């Protein structure tokens, strides 16, 4: 069975032809449903002859890194044959070419599968804001899949596809890969290009990936990272930012006050927290401890503040013209929007630019941040019965991370004793990517037999 | 007149007590209004003086020693009101705004507050219930800027440099119309503590002064890092450093098809004049599409950048709009009307200009404009001050929301003596660069 890129790559070096990996991958999906994973699916004829096409260009001695690995695509982000719904039975939007990011993944021979389920418009970080059926955790089909990238997510940790992507505004790209014992790589605002993606918070947004391991999630990341003239969002970066890096031998990391750390009641989070927390200070690592407040204020900007005004501009039209294929949840956050003013976001921009100026203090004493990804994981009851406090909850450790131009990556860190894993995530700087992510691999591997 | 000028007279051992009470007899015997809104009183400016000479009796590095300077009255001195060029704007702060500070640990003294557009918001002096401060050059036409007492100060001989601010372009227009340098620092490069913002994410305070190096020297000692000001940005080092340009380089100018110069052909000539010396200098004419730039400029006032002015006066528009100048009033108040997400899609519309933009900055060094591309009288602007004043703002209003560097200096005068000045705008921190070529502009 596959799982990682590695093990196609090894089963392909072995003579096994992609093709009826593929046709073998899409038999599976069949015999089982489509939903609540899995939105739409690129025809079977379309995916083979994409990979036809890859394949002549492998045998003309192409360099085709990813060659015959499918992959699914969170229905927010465009692959040409196929409609973006982005989780609402009204945007009918059939797009003409790839997004820029699926383009170079497909120019490196990847095969998008097709369109995962999601939150809708991105907006949640649970999964179950959806009307294509509610995806659930892999590990326990009562609980959330988390996220918003929520069918990309359990697609990669169910073994159908080795990779995923997602995006992330508030926590999308890193909850579900928490919930789902994946990792969540959150690439620096503008490596990856915006261009083909509908988006949630323009301003903020990153497509993200999701694999098993930090090695296959930088693999996809250094193939999709790139500068897109047409994306005003979009930064040159180079070979520079996700460049693995041995950590030296003592650093320091940054954790909140352990008093006012916060995990809703579930204890057993709390005591896997502090065994990650002991595991980085053996690895060398000096525990800092500092004032969570700031980081606090910033992440309920978001929602609290003026930034949910993105997300309204993001679908104006459709909001106005057609509210009710708005998911009701979703629905009176976006519309909310409706009632702040120009006055409020600029307010809003310089009270952040303030919370930016106070967290400086932390990172001038630190080389990298460590929290948990997701304080507590919910039922799918509790979370239709409380759907917006609940979900905001999940948001508490990740949500000013865009805001204040961070790069972040999601990675496992052990599981509760009812089989629920539980995730931390490093946070670096800008274009911090590669630096994280090696510390980030070299903390999943401490103590991991091979 | 200038800096120099101090030094030479406090070096052949003129007392600097003498020169303060002199001057602030000068102001007495003619009008404190239009171009002064208040005066700090002798007997604070002489004390201020003294612990000065204590200081620089006990070794100290004062480079500013006994150099009076004037305040645009929308930044802090200790000791005077703020007024903003408000009559019912009450504010008398405790302590001197960050840059002030700076300026009085440095030996400098602030005679006082000088007039401007009220908030900042305007490019010609005209809007002020203080007196309308006039062209030094002719007194029926416009000082400029919305930094109008500060620049006719300076040109009339009073002072030697003053602080303005600019966030469309008020620190440069009053510069060009009086014959003065006006350095536009990068955002951020000097503290915004202790000024009454008007678009608190655009807004530098500037310099004003007769020459480039007079502005420098003052620019080196304002500028540095205010940890309390969430906007205020480390650079230091070189940023203000003064290399010499080298022997050929790339300036670039607006296609001729799409200059504007609005009917004044005098102005369009000396520009010309500018191009060809720069050329003379050793520079390639680059010839740039303006329209982004254009485009950028617009976002200031036809866009939501105009709610920034609403925030930072939100309560005395909402609470006592009557005391707000009436066409400073329904700018500001139309901002009422714009939404979160119309602001958002500003921002959106903004970044597609600046990576527009980026394609010309990818061909030059240095950007040379016009700093005003016409002047206007008294008169014509009372009579149409809404229109006359954007057209003052075509080449200046997009500098701050890209983000660039600036300093406008002198060009040459009109046959009817009125004088017209060239911008030079480069990107962020090439604050010294710029001013080198600016001043072997001036010179050569």
């Known amino acids: 069975h596959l799982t990682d890129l590695a093990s196609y790559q090894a089963a392909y070096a072995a003579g096994t032809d992609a093709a009826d990996v593929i046709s073998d991958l899409y038999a599976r999906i069949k015999e089982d449903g489509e939903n609540p994973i899995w939105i739409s699916l690129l025809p079977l004829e379309s995916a083979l002859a994409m990979l036809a096409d890859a394949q002549q260009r492998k045998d003309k001695g192409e360099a085709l890194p990813l060659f015959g690995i499918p992959f699914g695509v969170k229905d927010n982000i465009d692959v040409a044959g196929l409609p973006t719904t982005a989780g609402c039975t009204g945007f009918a939007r059939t797009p003409r070419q790839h997004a820029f990011v699926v383009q170079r993944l497909v120019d490196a021979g ?10 809708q418009f991105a907006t949640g970080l649970n999964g179950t804001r959806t009307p294509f059926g509610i995806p659930r955790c892999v590990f326990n089909e009562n609980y959330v899949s988390g996220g918003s990238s929520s069918g990309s997510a359990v697609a990669v940790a169910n073994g159908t596809v080795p ?23 959150k690439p620096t605002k503008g490596l990856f290009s915006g261009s083909g993606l ?4 323009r301003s903020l947004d990153c497509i993200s990936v999701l694999a098993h391991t930090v090695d296959d999630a930088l693999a996809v990341a250094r193939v999709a990272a790139g500068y897109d003239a047409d994306d005003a969002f979009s930064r040159k970066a180079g070979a520079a930012a996700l460049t693995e890096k041995s950590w030296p031998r003592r650093f320091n990391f940054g954790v909140p006050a352990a008093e006012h750390r916060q995990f809703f009641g579930d204890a057993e989070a709390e005591a896997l927290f502090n065994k990650a927390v002991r595991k980085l200070e053996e690895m060398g690592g000096t525990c800092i401890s500092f004032d969570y407040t700031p980081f606090r204020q910033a992440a309920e900007l978001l929602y609290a503040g003026p930034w949910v005004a993105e997300r309204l501009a993001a679908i104006e039209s459709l909001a106005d013209e057609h509210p009710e294929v708005l998911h009701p949840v979703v629905r009176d956050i976006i519309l909310s929007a409706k009632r702040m003013s120009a006055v409020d976001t600029f307010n809003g921009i310089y009270r952040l630019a303030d919370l930016v100026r106070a967290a400086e203090s932390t990172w001038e004493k630190i080389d990298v941040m460590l929290l948990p990804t997701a304080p507590t994981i919910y039922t799918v009851e509790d ?11 999940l948001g508490f450790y990740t949500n000013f991370v865009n805001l204040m131009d961070l790069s972040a990556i999601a990675v496992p860190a052990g599981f509760r004793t009812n089989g629920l894993p539980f995730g931390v995530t490093f946070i670096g700087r800008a274009f911090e990517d ?17």
């Not at 990847?110 to 939150?119: E, V």
């Not at 505004?169 to 994946?182: E, M, V, Y």
Request: proline share 6%; glycine share 10%; aromatic share 4%.
């Open 434 to 450: 590669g630096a994280i992510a090696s510390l980030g691999k070299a903390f999943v591997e401490h103590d991991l037999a091979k």
């Open 110 to 119: 990847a095969i998008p599968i097709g369109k995962t389920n999601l939150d």
């Open 383 to 393: 979370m239709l019965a409380d759907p917006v406090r609940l979900n905001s909850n």
């Open 198 to 201: 509908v988006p949630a918070a």
């Open 163 to 185: 990779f995923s992507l997602g995006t992330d505004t508030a926590g999308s790209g890193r909850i579900p890969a928490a919930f789902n014992n994946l990792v969540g790589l």
